[model samples]
Target: MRFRDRRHAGALLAEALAPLGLEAPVVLGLPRGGVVVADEVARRLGGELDVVLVRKVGAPGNPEFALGAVGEGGELVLMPYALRYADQSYLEREAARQRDVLRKRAERYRRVRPKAARKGRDVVLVDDGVATGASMEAALSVVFQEGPRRVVVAVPVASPEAVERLKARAEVVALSVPQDFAAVGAYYLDFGEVTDEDVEAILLEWAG
Candidate 1:
């Protein structure tokens, strides 16, 4: 399904999630664009808003392509496709690079909003969309380490393979799952860039 924008998709996604009867869930968004969608969900569900730090470990020569991803707390997830993209040393180096990025981003985001506790809390992880699902998988590993009561991967749209892959770990709430999936931007009419300042503003507003 096509979305007018991230906020619009998030509103509809929040509506879809309302039926689940969650109790003051902690909503964590993947930066930078994911937080736009997540802000709406946190507001609609009356949940605490926070950011989850993660970085994609891009394949060599094609930075847009994900070899895997690294998340907060040094959680790493390497996809099987990573082997086809680079050697073991290259993958190890890339993972270390992305982990450092996550560390820096966490410090940046924490300035605006303190980290929300996930232990014994129901958590909803929001993203604009997913392609390979590697990023979300890494984020899940991070969340699981905190011992949350439950975890759900919420997105507007996703590929069938991605949904299948994530379903094994968490209950996925995707508005649309298309078989012939393209890039995440292709599903949005106005897929504009989201800056770090945009994320801080959302967190600050929610904090107030």
Candidate 2:
């Protein structure tokens, strides 16, 4: 099913997850978009909402495509395809630049609220959707090191291949995984850019 927006996606996902009886649930939204989707899920679940900060390390020509990704605390995921397209000289700079960018982003998002503890916490990592899966992979990598009891990767929509890949790490809850999954935005009618103000407002709303 196509999602009207991230809010609609989150509400639907929350319903799907309601009966799971998640234990010690903590929703970690991958900002600066997933937080909007995650706010509804956290609210419905009666769980704490936080952001799993991740940055895409993009190739030189096509910044939309992920060469790899860097998550908070230096966690990195490099894709094989990215290697073929990107220059080695550029990659060295890209890696360092993205890592620093992600670190700063983490600090900014966590300005008011500290990151949710992972150990003994049942963490649900939420994103609008996944296409290439690099960002989600990097996110999971960062969280796994914290010793969470279980990690559940939830999304409104995703590629079937991404679902299969993420399943290797954690239980995946997806509303739809169509074979023809082209991109994350293709399924959404209003997948507009989520701004920093929107993130802060949602964080504040969730905090209370």
Candidate 3:
């Protein structure tokens, strides 16, 4: 259940997506991890690459566990179950904080390559993997507002439930659906942390 890295997985995912024959496609990647994977996809598919800028809203008890997420185009998704566990003030503050971080990220990336226009285009949203689908959902909510012809969710690995839950909204493509999928990091051999600098470097290369 270990991929060589996101690069290898991106190559494999690009092969799987090649036959789709997307028309006038625009790729929106959820940074910072998603950008690495999407860079390869954009190179392979010959499509414009851009960042979506989504940030996860972590729960009170577990910092790793996402309560939901905030995404670009001013979209926010919060789990009803998580609402019961977290304070309203806490959730609001977390969402606002992440949204601020997302704003800065968007500014940094767009300075290299301006955000791609998606209206009436085939929109392919890429991510490394979906653990809770919170971030993905927030992305879809925002992307949907642009009136895209089609919305494609591209990923290296994801849980079975996320595929079904998201399939209703977008065309879902997942390379692996391990039944024992616990965390996204578990599937990759080198799931190293992706920093802001790494994202900037990738975008800079793509911009040139």
Candidate 4:
């Protein structure tokens, strides 16, 4: 199934998550596309909306393929195979690059609203879709450290493998999980890229 746009995808996703609506959980989205979907989820559940900043550290030449992901508070998640091919020099360089991006994103997010304190709260992590699940994994790891009462991973579309991997980390709530998933954008007809400015605006709007 293909979504008309992120808003349409979010409407469908909200239907899938109707059961959770009654819980009034705080919705945490992975910025850019995730924010669009999450805005609706937060509306449906009458919850506050926020974003978890994560940046994928891709390989030297293949930037689309993530070697790992970094999150706020200096949290990093690396795939075992990526580490096998990566050395201290490679990691040091990539770490510096990813850290810079993370710092900037965190600053932007904070400018819109204060950093969310998830201690003992019901937190649901939302995203437009999931591919490798690397970034989501890093976001989950960071939130888990914050002592939330429960953590739920929510998405509109995800590969079964990605869903399974994410489920291993936290309770997952995916609307569509196809067996032949390729890219997350494949399921959406109008999946535009989200910029930092869009994220900043969305957070500011949500807070207001």
Q: What ranges in model 4 sit over 4 Å off?
A: 56-70, 75-96
lDDT of 4 by residue, 1-208 (tens): 7888988877777777777643667789887789889988888777788888777777877776667777766766666678777775786688678889779768768877777668888898888999878778878766776789888888989998888889987888887888899888888889888887887878887664
| Worst window of 10 by summed lDDT in candidate 1 | 71-80
Q: Candidate 1 residues 1-24, lDDT tens each?
A: 889999999999899999888889
RMSD of each candidate relative to the true structure: 3.6, 3.9, 3.7, 3.3
Model 3 accuracy (lDDT, Cα): 0.82
**Candidate 2 residues 92-190, lDDT tens each?**
788788887777666766786776677888899999998867778878866776788878899999998899889987889999999898889999999
C-alpha RMSD of candidate 3: 3.7
Q: Report the Cα lDDT for candidate 1.
A: 0.86
lDDT of 3 by residue, 10-112 (tens): 8888888999989757878887789888988888888877888767788886866777777654467776677787988999988888888778667777787
> Measured by TM-score, how close is model 4 to the native structure?
0.81
**TM-score to true structure, per model:** 0.83, 0.80, 0.80, 0.81
For model 1, state the Cα shift of residue 97 in Å: 2.6
Best by lDDT: 1
lDDT of residue 70 for candidate 3: 75
Model 4 poorest 10 in a row by lDDT: 16-25
Residue pairs in candidate 3 whose N, alpha carbon or C atoms collide under 3 angstroms: none
Question: Number of clashing pairs, model 2?
Answer: 0
**How accurate locally, in lDDT, is each candidate?**
0.86, 0.82, 0.82, 0.80
Q: List the residue pairs that clash in candidate 2.
A: none
What's the C-alpha lDDT at position 57 in model 3? Answer: 83
